[model samples]
Target: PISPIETVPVKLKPGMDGPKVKQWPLTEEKIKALVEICTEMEKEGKISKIGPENPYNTPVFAIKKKDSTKWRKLVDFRELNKRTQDFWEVQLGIPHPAGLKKKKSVTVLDVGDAYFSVPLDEDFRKYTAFTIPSINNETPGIRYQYNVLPQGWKGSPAIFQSSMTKILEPFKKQNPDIVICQYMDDLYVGSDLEIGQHRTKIEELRQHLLRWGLTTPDKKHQKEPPFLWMGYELHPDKWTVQPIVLPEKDSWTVNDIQKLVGKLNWASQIYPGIKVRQLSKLLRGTKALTEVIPLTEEAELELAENREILKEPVHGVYYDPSKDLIAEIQKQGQGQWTYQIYQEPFKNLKTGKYARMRGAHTNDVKQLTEAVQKITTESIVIWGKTPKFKLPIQKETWETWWTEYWQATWIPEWEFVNTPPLVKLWYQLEKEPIVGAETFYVDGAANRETKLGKAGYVTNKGRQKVVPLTNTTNQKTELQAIYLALQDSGLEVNIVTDSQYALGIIQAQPDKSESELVNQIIEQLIKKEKVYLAWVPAHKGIGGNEQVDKLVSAGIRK
Candidate 1:
């Protein structure tokens, strides 16, 4: 007889009177497999002949081998799950191999038919019954069901894992250096112990399992640095979970998009800046079975950005890719140029040491413009060349010049130019004059490199100036954009924006600084002259909002 471990009770929803039943037609080969399974289970005392009052009839299916023989048998518990409406909570506190802070050798284990090892209560056994054919033509058929826990039951996994938790609790307390991470049938042991102690601990665990009548596969034990856990590659040296490389798809169906979005959301903690919410918006409000929608422009852009972000190795140490890239660029001197104008030496008043004055005076406007374009807040120091005594120009003067020159000369570029009428209107109305009842739109974006926020606004007349704020959040930048728009617009104006935070603060007079700005604008409005705050859904067909979003992104780009 097969050994059995004690199992927990399976609770059903209240007011449910009897067991639910589902029946399915089976092929001759499938019936043969079912009979074989029932016979073996009977010998193992895992199943017994059911009584006439057996209330449930779950459907069964067989997985066949190449020779057309049964390889595995399974029960479909979908009906039971639907009827019971049971809720299960499963927590896998398993960290990836790279996630462990200390140096540790990992050992992986797999339990064999984990669910079946747990015994089922006698009262619940009748709910798992299935019908079978007669042994001979003359005899009547019989109904059989599992006495022990069965695979595909509604509460099998939660109950099994809970039992494993209890069984492994003592070992966890005894061995302080060893960590046990469990995900369903798989168990991972992370330890820094030597071979002798490790093997002794392993033997101790085996003895415990034997006493509890639970078994694991002999050949499934894995030990070493590189291992596979929960569908991800875990390498101690690599220091991060690496997803298995997926094949590229020419196009994705609606279902495929849903699955991919779900996966990305689940893995968002491991990979940040993927714009998960932005990508999810594409699939929102889509009806079931609707034909697959083609990728949107924003979706394509986010995908490309995420691809680049994911390509870098997550060093599991203190590191930033943008900073590393900028440092490497400065070291190579690829995108930078310098000019020095020698000045007369002067003696220090206190130390009496002579120091020469130095400054950069490059007339290469094209190269200077390009180099200035590449300048970030961190790299701005290098651009600040101290001039000689004759022309003691502050760094801010040149910095302001660079900003004005670039804003005047640089033309915005688009990647996939399928411009909607709203987007096209911005360029068309660039030189148009503003008429009565002026409309203003404002937006803000954050820089990836500097973490600074930039705000921009647009009106019927033309696009306004872009304002970059130091150490500002996106919400603050958005508020700043609104304030700038209100200051620049005339009476009888309507302010349009996509920021709900600014709108909320404007409607309710809070004691915050943003509210103070809103109150100032409200105070400026006189009789017959008014300003209205209007909310517009972003990235939709709004001319001014679209223009402002693009302008802000361009200004914030490093």
Candidate 2:
């Protein structure tokens, strides 16, 4: 018998309904997986059999699991999502394996089929119904609707993580000695207490999860010397970082190469000599996922060298509070230089005395101070240079160089890049919309290192959209989001943006300015109604802005 956690039924926004499109195309393996899902779910009473006449049957397809050896069923709800209201907001980011404190023992438990344990709202389940085609032609296929939360609904992780945290809260009170960390389906229970005592907490936690109808493997393993969490082997001496062996493909796509480089970074975390420049250099010009560029002779040989490294056991630097930590930070690279600074003298006054160097140029070589435990580092030393073109600091004398060498055409003008926001609040205006107007928030993300970006916006009415951004600067991504928010033309909308630069540009007129996106924004404002561009403190708990911040991060990721 299964007991599902109570959850709100997913409702479509007003007038939002699934499109009447053909079912998703599936391969033979996927069809078999869907049929298997239907058969097992119906037999177990986990899903309700539905008539083929249902109009809202969304596309359902199968994808191979990266960890487990099974096909995971997912619904392509991008259409449904457009019409649905956003009801979830997880406070972002998952804890890496390195986050654990110095502990005597640690245990990681994965809840089997975590999403299925949450029951769906009965009345709204039909909106997300799925159909599987018959294997033999001319025979009727099965139609069924989920009775519980289905994966790929966008809100699944939000709901799953939120609910799972709730389930673990009381258990945390009971086991105060153990650190009960919960992230979606995985649970991390670790303690500085003796290994035997830690197992006692793990046993009780397992019982708690079972009472809530969550399952873990019945098989038991001794975690005396070291216990595995995710793929990291958490031993006292050295926590061995595990490397995933991706299946060999004749040719790799841009995304496949991206995944390979990402894994190599993690696998090489412990080994100082294991450099990623060779792999990252291969990742340039990643246009799309469909490119089937056959492996080059150069790439083939380099990949073999990587495979050879992974063949040997790799271990990560273990947490050691007693030893003096050496943080190796780097400044501008090339010239292969290494410098060591002793004690707090390592702190530079270039930014300010003892200024915390967070991706800075103040001259310090130290590991980032983002760890939970206080680091007592006394000295710093850095490695070889990264040999990449350095970005010029915008606000410096470079601004003077802008008009000094205007129309150089070789370098970008500095003033156009960073437009400081000159904010005028809608509420502050004499003709304020009487607290009767809808508020919209726009946000965007760009990576300086990767040169990829995303943009999104959210409305007070729960209307929102996030799309991938490209061929744009960091500021332009924000402009793209602001432009997107202007679509609700007929309504009196007050659009808010956290970017001062974007806000300044919109309110101050888009002057075919060095900013191309601004001119685009100007033309749209002609048709947009009562559209007011205003500013707010980003991530300051403003509902729409905070939500859009998370929304755009979704866009940034594939």
Candidate 3:
């Protein structure tokens, strides 16, 4: 049976006490920034109460910063940077003769469990209506009641921006040759160099952060980093943070454990001698706590433990004893009373602290284990060594298909790797339409008197047959072929030509970018899809490459 309280409490209780808020008295600049953030919210129709969605909690400041010395509270207003689905950035650095070449050398430096800020006070305007600081029994802070959602919350975007700005400022100021940006704690940097160049670029940026008061842990340095910055991973020689690995548990849900794991991972290296049990609780994925009492009890305990460990003023341990209790609870089920701690003792580059027992213990074990009585009938051993992740790919597979795909073939052979693959008919996910397109492949070679550019489309059927056409100038001829392909292909209205000369016609002429012929065929097709154009490589002797050459050479003589 569930507890009496069935409905979820969305808002905090009246006069509910939290960390003390600051009464530093908002300076004009702060107030203006707050108002501006709120104003932007109104313009974007995010003023409604209920609109403040999950992973989207608005700030109601405790006034006092979340620090031990402060107990004062104040209503704060700011928005944290949000991760958006349709977000794209233009990072610059590599001398791309074309346009921006997307960077894949990503180094995700998650600021482990970094707390974000949100707007504390609510201001109503347009659509729906509600007043703040004037309520009873209602969750006091910022209440979204339908009409408009809270746009910008205090500390919400600012904290995110501040962290990111801190990481990127150096690149912008000192190393314009490098580009770094932070999305929340997720930071990205871009450079033009290949593997070695990329690695050097990453370390340069990391060293910059080090000088700027941020240091990455050594464990990360040892393990190859998968840190993705700006949609790219670090070069081999680069170092980056890794997310904490959690064990399996039924009662733990992804969100519950993930939040804790995320928080701890940010500063996991900061704390020394952290109890392994505490971490086990947050790592398990299940929903054991249903009722408010149990949730509050466990959460409060977790919070208290976090405070205690943090209170010790340790360098990295951010999570507290509740994690231990959670771990203990699981251990109880197993009937095992013992647990193990696996840590590599190292000297901190910044703090000069060792991974000692308390905060930084000097004497830890290499193959740690603990003798424990049987848990359940399993009688499992507690300590010795934490099993290493047997990565699915074997050592030989590094040169085999497995690693080869992750490292090589798939990248160069990417044309056929995506959605519709290399097929002429591609399934456009967003548009929900099957693009029965034609790639007008063309071959280019310097002729004695004139340049030879052959063009033809590999039809939607994946067959390549010669198409007849008249010719003129190289550019005009390609454009004519584009027009001819559009006219002849009754399938749909999209065409790709391996002719840069044709592309130049459209790219060069502004009005003619979409201009069409008298039949309105070109206009109709161009209007339907914005006259698609591309320059395909020539004389590759590939299927499509050879097909276009024959079609164009034959047509020119005809």
Candidate 4:
């Protein structure tokens, strides 16, 4: 059985980590030794032989500069960064304090500047191959020292930055509105919340860095405890985070209840009249009558006397047709569409009961009416509303399907909204909002000559919102906002307007004489949603009729 099983020592392909150059790679143990040696040299105040030289040829005093010194010029590491292909772009979300005038006691911290330089002094040149003693000093004279940077070393800045950023990630994720930034050593944070979350992240990062033996600037380098990052300020409140502006209302959320309770002494800052009127507001009016009331030793009768009242009977409509005819209309209008019902009136011939149109139907209308007949339609009611006709429960809205899909899939969701962050960062940076509307519904004249106009349900909705924006510079810009809105949320959108000429071109059915501006809107809308065309009364608010008079007037004035 065994003529020496001829198996050639299972050879692996190159680059696989298996019996590969056993002792060549650097490890934590070796790195620690190197750090220790560096620390010893640092403690002894021995200047490295490769230290930078003074410009005047005089003995230079190489002392640690105060971290607060705001030095502007630093090496342009962009070239190196490009080679590394490890770009770390920092984004900020801050509310603009534009038109609001409110004094917000906000604080910001700056981390000065960071720079890197190559060794130049001569004293450390001979020993470049090795440094002082190391932790893993194996085989007597061999020493472990840094000579060449390993792969991914160019991206070391990101790794080091991550260590500081992890502490901030949690706070940012929790409060998306808090403004934050990281550019080299620049940090700016702010928020409108009562408290500052970004500040907490900064402090946490500083403490961790100190613990990890990384020296940070002193009070001179950074003037405050919690510092700013990039160029934005941060504020963290129990309920929300805002940038720059102070919160107008300090209302606490359910999650903030504990924080409020713990700081009873500071209650006046959040809830005025903490001592006497606190309980009054806490147990406002009749609400306490239904809520559970705790009894103290002084009021021992709570168990026997304090009874919980069934607040107002649950607002519900029970099926009752006779005496409570109103109750039967319950299920039909319970917030959402529910069911359809059929009802008709006839005279009761047998009982000689003159059951007019007010009474129940004596005959089935479905059986009587051959064309529009159905098996059911008995008296259907939901939530006090009576459903005269049968209705179907629906989930998908075909009207805004394209608009919603583009918003959810193409562009980022936040950019679609007319919020401060999007207007500042996205609009200002790109000189335009990221155009991502997939289709546009033309309900107006996109091409007047060709009589081309398309209309869809959701496109009409977007048209409604866009119509309200009177400050749009041109039809193209106005169309851009409409497209962005469709991508914001896939809702049933409709654009009802008198621009039938614009609608025609939007549907790709246009004549050469059609308005160029209308064609532009059509082209833009098609890029946003799966558009359809329809015509409605120009003036009357019927069917898909749009209010174009006021909109056109407003745009013209603007």
Q: Pick the candidate with the highest TM-score.
A: 1
Residue 239 lDDT in candidate 1: 43
Global lDDT of model 2: 0.56
Residue 319, candidate 3: alpha-carbon lDDT: 14
Candidate 3 residue lDDT tens string, 108-143: 454422321122224222112222332233323333
Candidate 1 similarity to native, TM-score: 0.52
lDDT of each: 0.54, 0.56, 0.35, 0.29
Candidate 2 lDDT, tens digit per residue, 58-169?
Answer: 7767787688877777677677667667875775543443323356676667777887777767766776677777654643657788777766576667777777888887
TM-score of every model? 0.52, 0.47, 0.20, 0.23
lDDT of 4 by residue, 420-522 (tens): 1110100001112223432333222222332322222233234343333322333333334334433443423333334443333333222122334444443
TM-score of 4: 0.23
lDDT-better candidate, 1 vs 3? 1
TM-score of predicted model 3?
Answer: 0.20
**Clash pairs detected, candidate 2:** 327-366, 329-365, 329-366, 421-500
What are the root-mean-square deviations of the candidates from the true structure over C-alphas? 19.0, 22.0, 27.4, 27.3
Q: What are the runs in model 2 whose C-alpha is more than 4 Å off? A: 13-15, 24-39, 52-54, 60-78, 81-84, 87-91, 96-99, 132-142, 221-233, 240-269, 273-558
lDDT (tens digit, per residue) of candidate 1 on 1-558: 234446566655675533455455456556776778878887777888875876677776667556664467777666665555454677534433222334345576776677776777666777777766543353245677887777777777777787888888786678667777677787777566665677667667766765666776544344555565554456433344467232236565567666666655434334433344345656765576456657677667666665676676342321121221111011112122321111212210000011111221112222333332433322233223222111112234334444534235441111212211111100001113334657777787676467788877777676577877787777768777777776777766667778877766554322212245444543443222456767777778676666777676565342
